[PDB]
Design a protein around this ligand. Structure first.
Ligand SMILES: [Mg+2]
Ligand SMILES: [Mg+2]
Ligand SMILES: [Mg+2]
Ligand SMILES: [Mg+2]
Ligand SMILES: [Mg+2]
Ligand SMILES: [Mg+2]
Ligand SMILES: [Mg+2]
Ligand SMILES: [Mg+2]
Ligand SMILES: [Mg+2]
Ligand SMILES: [Mg+2]
Ligand SMILES: [Mg+2]
Ligand SMILES: [Mg+2]
Ligand SMILES: [Mg+2]
Ligand SMILES: [Mg+2]
Ligand SMILES: [Mg+2]
Ligand SMILES: [Mg+2]
Ligand SMILES: [Mg+2]
Ligand SMILES: [Mg+2]
Lengths: 124, 141, 55, 185
RNA sequence: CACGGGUGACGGGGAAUCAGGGUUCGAUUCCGGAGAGGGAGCCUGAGAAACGGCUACCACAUCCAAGGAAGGCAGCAGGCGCGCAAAUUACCCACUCCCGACCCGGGGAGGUAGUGACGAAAAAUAACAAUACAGGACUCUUUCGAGGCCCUGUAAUUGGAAUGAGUCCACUUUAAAUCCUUUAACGAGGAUCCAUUGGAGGGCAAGUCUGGUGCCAGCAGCCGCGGUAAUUCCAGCUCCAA
């Protein structure tokens, strides 16, 4: 009962992708997840769901319509070439480091104090 | 206007600029003598330390004993006969306490039965006299 | 003298507040106000009595 | 320097005299007639009426065959026709001054639901608006201040997610059915 | 109207009140100016008399083995003091851009969250049906009374019907979260899931009600009220303004 339509279709050869605004109609249930969005776009466009990246859903009032954006790359190599690392880490092919920002600033200001090769020996 | 020439702008402007100073509100607002004589110093509220409680006799026909407080300010050190507004609220005010002092709504003027009192008390030791009168809060002891 | 502070407030009789059905509020209060003003009463001769008028 | 609007405007203006008996009489009759929530609901429609009448006076003070006057007059007549207070044959900038708070309150969605008759009373219509039983062009309206356009007047009906419409029953009906089945066995 | 003085005066676009005219404010996110406790001087560099650059003096202040060394939060958070008066010692470069040898790094600029009743916009705290009653356009009846095609309101009388506020799995949101919207399951009859703030002599809407006080307490922005029957105090009820 979930229906996906596409608006504002555009082909970016300079980004090697497709792009459209996704309109999801889901009467009788909640907001459907992005995995089901990628699966239904995959069975719509006859491609693998690995290259389909969908983000940014906003649900209208009343509860029968959402608005979201999505892009469909040519390959995963092109997706890793021009796709943000945080939206790659949303799905899990990329994993960012866990070094916290204030501790990185403190380590940088500690390495600023000591001159020489011992800048590496200051950190741990 | 009296001089109705086509180029009497400086005459009309200088005459009005001279005659604005004879207005009571304009001269009080634009001279620093009233702001110096004001104990608040261009302020709406002021905290001050209680030192004694005064029973002020009333004016003509209305005859009563109003209850005032000799408040010494913090920002200037000036002394104010501040007024205790509600009934039975002098007992809440003890000696050597910080109380909040506001006006009475006539913009620095003695009001009604009370001679020589311009200001009143709002809060008593960070506890409001309105809540002390209504019975909502308690004096911190 | 300052000995008579709170005299009448001390010596009045402490009357307890009567328990009462809670009043309707907002649009329902203004609707009930309109109903008790206009649609209930009729135009009568003489001077019309006030809302809180009693005898 | 932060990136935000800081643009706001008071939609209502309080009157100059607070305790006019005739003014309170008129506003009380308006609230009791069209089912309003407070005096601010009168005052904001009065202030929008003041805006429209001030624009109308500013157009009538302009000269005839002025391009700004003709453009703003045609635009304001188009706005009055599309909100449906002024008639499509009556549209002339001299007739804007003869317009009234009652005809502005006639286009309230609460009043339009009451005139279409799907609700019993005006405040019952306001209860339906608050409880989200009605929709306008497949869009649920929760707020009774919806200025219904003349083009979108005929599309007012019950919403799909509503027990008064074609949907699931409410909490009271479900609880009564569950208690009945529990008492039966 | 020079010069001098004061400014509780950075200037402007602009803000409020506004008929038409004016009056007051503008430190405040945009443009330009000035400054980094007070002045003064200089290196580097295209661009500084730069202060998260130095060099001296004054005020303040740290360590010392008493020879000496080091400082500038009117940056972001936060602490003291001053006050009538004003927020978290948070998360992140993902949005906007800036800089660098630069697609990769950095940014307390900035973005997002925590406090927030400065303020602005929308806006819950009930509605319906049935009984008793109190009445209005008809018919009938001299009035009293009666039938309901039409009604309107009231009463801790009864009845189910509908929903949030909250609780809470799950998506969505987001750099990662939070909130909004969606969505199962709970969740309302004194729907105790209880709306207050001021007043009731006049101005100014709204009791010559009841009890106490007796020019005392107090009320009162103005006139005035209280001197033992207070429409003005203190309490209850009722009503009025939002
Ligand atoms: Mg007198
Ligand atoms: Mg100066
Ligand atoms: Mg200055
Ligand atoms: Mg300025
Ligand atoms: Mg400088
Ligand atoms: Mg400083
Ligand atoms: Mg310098
Ligand atoms: Mg600094
Ligand atoms: Mg700097
Ligand atoms: Mg404040
Ligand atoms: Mg960035
Ligand atoms: Mg980068
Ligand atoms: Mg900042
Ligand atoms: Mg409530
Ligand atoms: Mg009273
Ligand atoms: Mg009065
Ligand atoms: Mg009156
Ligand atoms: Mg009075």
């Amino acid at each position: 009962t979930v229906t996906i339509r596409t608006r504002k279709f555009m082909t970016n050869r300079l980004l090697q992708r497709k792009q459209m605004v996704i309109d999801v109609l889901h009467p009788g249930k909640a907001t459907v997840p992005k995995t089901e969005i990628r699966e239904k776009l995959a069975k719509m466009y006859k491609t693998t769901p690995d290259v389909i990246f969908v983000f940014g859903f906003r649900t209208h009032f009343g509860g029968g319509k959402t608005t979201g954006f999505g892009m469909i790359y040519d390959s995963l190599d092109y997706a890793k070439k021009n796709e943000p690392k945080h939206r790659l880490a949303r799905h899990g092919l990329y994993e960012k480091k866990k070094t916290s920002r204030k501790q990185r600033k403190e380590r940088k200001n500690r390495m600023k104090k000591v001159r020489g090769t011992a800048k590496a020996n200051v950190g741990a | 206007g009296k001089c109705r020439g086509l180029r009497t702008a400086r005459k009309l402007r200088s005459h009005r600029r001279d005659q604005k100073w004879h207005d009571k509100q304009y001269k009080k607002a634009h001279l620093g003598t009233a702001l110096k004589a004001n104990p608040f110093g261009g302020a709406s509220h002021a905290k001050g330390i209680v030192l004694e409680k005064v029973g002020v006799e009333a004016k003509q026909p209305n005859s009563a004993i109003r209850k005032c407080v000799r408040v010494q300010l913090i920002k200037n050190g000036k002394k104010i006969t501040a007024f205790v507004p509600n009934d039975g609220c002098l007992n809440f005010i003890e000696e050597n306490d910080e109380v909040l002092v506001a006006g009475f709504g006539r913009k620095g003027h003695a009001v009604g039965d009370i001679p020589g009192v311009r200001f009143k008390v709002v809060k008593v030791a960070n506890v409001s006299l309105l809540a002390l009168y209504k019975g909502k809060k308690e004096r911190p002891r | 003298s300052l000995a008579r502070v709170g005299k009448v407030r001390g010596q009045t009789l402490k009357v307890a507040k009567q328990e009462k059905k809670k009043k309707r509020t907002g649009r329902a209060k203004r609707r009930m106000q309109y109903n008790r003003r206009f649609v209930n009463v009729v135009p009568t001769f003489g001077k019309k009595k006030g809302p809180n008028a009693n005898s | 320097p932060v990136a935000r609007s800081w643009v706001c405007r008071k939609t209502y203006v309080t009157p100059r005299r607070p305790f006019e008996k005739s003014r309170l009489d008129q506003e009380l009759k308006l609230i009791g007639e069209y089912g309003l929530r407070n005096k601010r609901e009168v005052w904001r429609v009065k202030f929008t009426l003041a805006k429209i009448r001030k624009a109308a006076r500013e157009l009538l003070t302009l000269d005839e065959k002025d391009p700004r006057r003709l453009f703003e007059g045609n635009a304001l007549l188009r706005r009055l026709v599309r909100i449906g207070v002024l008639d499509e044959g009556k549209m002339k900038l001299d007739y804007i001054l003869g317009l009234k708070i009652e005809d502005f309150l006639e286009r309230r969605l609460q009043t339009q639901v009451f005139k279409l008759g799907l609700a019993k009373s005006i405040h019952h219509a306001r209860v339906l608006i608050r409880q989200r039983h009605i929709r306008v062009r497949k869009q649920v309206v929760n707020i009774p201040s919806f200025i219904v356009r003349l083009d979108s007047q005929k599309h007012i009906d019950f919403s799909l997610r509503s027990p008064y419409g074609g949907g699931r029953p409410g909490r009271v009906k479900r609880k009564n059915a569950k208690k009945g089945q529990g008492g039966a066995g």
